[PDB]
């Protein structure tokens, strides 16, 4: 249960190492990935980033999956953080669903050359 201290622009966060280890592919869950942010003088990881977002990132580990955007945090900012902490695409997708968005389709005339050519005027 070795504890881990995460300092976000001065805002102090603490959790257990097994809590982060729950998601091995994320930034905070990968020893080789967070190594770069460790301050050996203060025994903490320091990130010069957005404060309001982190409660949510951390809770994602603690809750075991729940990734909710804080009511007071813009969606453009929070998604940038989700990407930075490398929570992965599977989580971002589910996050974006619950946030509202969701969709995507199309696909021009498969080869055709001329089929996919006309199918662009009608």
């Amino acid at each position: 249960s070795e504890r881990v201290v995460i300092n976000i622009s001065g805002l102090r966060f603490e959790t257990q190492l097994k809590t982060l280890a729950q998601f091995p592919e994320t930034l905070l869950g990968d020893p080789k990935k967070r190594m770069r942010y460790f301050d050996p003088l203060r025994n903490e990881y320091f990130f010069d980033r957005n404060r309001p977002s982190f409660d949510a990132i951390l809770y994602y580990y603690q809750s075991g999956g729940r990734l909710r955007r804080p009511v007071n945090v813009p969606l453009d900012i929070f998604s940038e953080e989700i990407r930075f902490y490398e929570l992965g695409e599977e989580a971002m997708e589910m996050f974006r669903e619950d946030e509202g968005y969701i969709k995507e389709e199309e696909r021009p005339l498969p080869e055709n050359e001329f089929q996919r050519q006309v199918w662009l005027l009608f």
Binding site: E2, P31, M35, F38, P40, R42, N43
Partner: protein, 326 residues
């Protein structure tokens, strides 16, 4: 390449090779030979000498101390280290409690005839003493000027990280080194677990028994030679390993490595030692030597170090087939 290295990330500079005193000093060899060995080492740039309260029940410290006093070498050109844990038969004379760390070091310093050691090590972990008590005591003897730095020995990385963590919490001094066993047939800890600690909290490794007590030298290809360590009274455990099933297996692999040695143009011991020094996480390697011939030959491991290329190392891994999992 560099003969002198920093011990971990501290400012203390040690020769990549040091000379220890287990078995030999006050034991297997004579005081005159011990003196001959240290002089040879010192005159060759080696500035690191390791001992322990437990070695020959404090006898090795006395011999080491008599030499330093007799030769008149400047204390500032030496790096003396001693380990603490087993200091007597009484219940209170063993462990990492504050009482034993202070009493133990005071008694070692007395036998060594020194005002202080450069690094005092906890010889092993102590399940019975809170980490805080141990870190505070190490810090106390350092602030008392009885030691310059402190380190661990045979501790897991979990334990070493704990000592570091407790040090930061209470504003104490963190350990700078871990004395771990390291040789061709013992690689897990040094190669898998300590590297993260070296990059994360500056802890360096000072490895011991690079020839596995002689096994990796090749002197046991046939049987147990006369006057060898495996033959000495009290080292039956060692003799068993060599004649063991696993023992024969190691001796067979040693014959395969014997070819890698000639390809590199060196002796087997020089290769075995230079091998331990290939990784940067290893600050220094503590050598053992029952006589001047061995020491002179072993110091030659330094010219082999530059030859340890990726290819040779991968080939040596093939022969050993014991490369640790990442």
């Amino acid at each position: 390449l560099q003969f002198y290295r920093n011990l971990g990330k501290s400012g203390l500079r040690v020769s990549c090779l040091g000379l220890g005193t287990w078995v030999t000093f006050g034991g297997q060899i004579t005081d005159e030979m011990a003196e001959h060995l240290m002089t040879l080492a010192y005159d060759n740039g080696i500035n690191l000498f390791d001992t322990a309260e437990v070695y020959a029940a404090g006898k090795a410290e006395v011999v080491l101390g008599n030499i330093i006093k007799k030769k008149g070498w400047r204390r500032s050109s030496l790096v003396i280290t001693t380990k603490i844990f087993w200091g007597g038969k009484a219940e209170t004379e063993r462990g990492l409690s504050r009482k034993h760390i202070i009493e133990g070091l005071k008694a070692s310093l007395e036998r060594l005839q020194l005002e202080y050691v450069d690094v005092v090590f906890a010889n092993r972990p102590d399940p019975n003493t809170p980490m805080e008590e141990t870190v505070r005591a190490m810090t106390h003897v350092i602030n008392q000027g009885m030691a310059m730095y402190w380190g661990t020995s045979r501790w897991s990385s979990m334990e070493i990280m704990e000592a570091y963590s407790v040090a930061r919490q209470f504003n104490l001094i963190p350990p700078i080194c871990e004395q771990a066993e390291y040789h061709m047939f013992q690689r897990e800890k040094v190669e898998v677990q300590l590297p993260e600690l070296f990059h994360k909290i500056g802890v360096g490794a000072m490895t011991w028994s690079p020839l596995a007590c002689g096994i990796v030298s090749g002197k046991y290809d046939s049987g147990i030679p006369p006057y060898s360590r495996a033959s000495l009274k009290g080292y039956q455990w060692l003799k068993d390993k060599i004649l063991s099933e696993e023992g024969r297996r190691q001796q067979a692999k040693l014959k395969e490595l014997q070819a890698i040695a000639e390809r590199l143009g060196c002796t087997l011991p020089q290769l075995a030692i230079a091998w331990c020094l290939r990784n940067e996480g290893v600050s220094s390697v503590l050598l053992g030597a029952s006589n001047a011939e061995q020491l002179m030959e072993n110091i030659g491991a330094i010219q082999v170090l530059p030859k340890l290329s990726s290819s040779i190392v991968h080939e040596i891994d093939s022969i050993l087939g014991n490369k640790p999992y990442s």
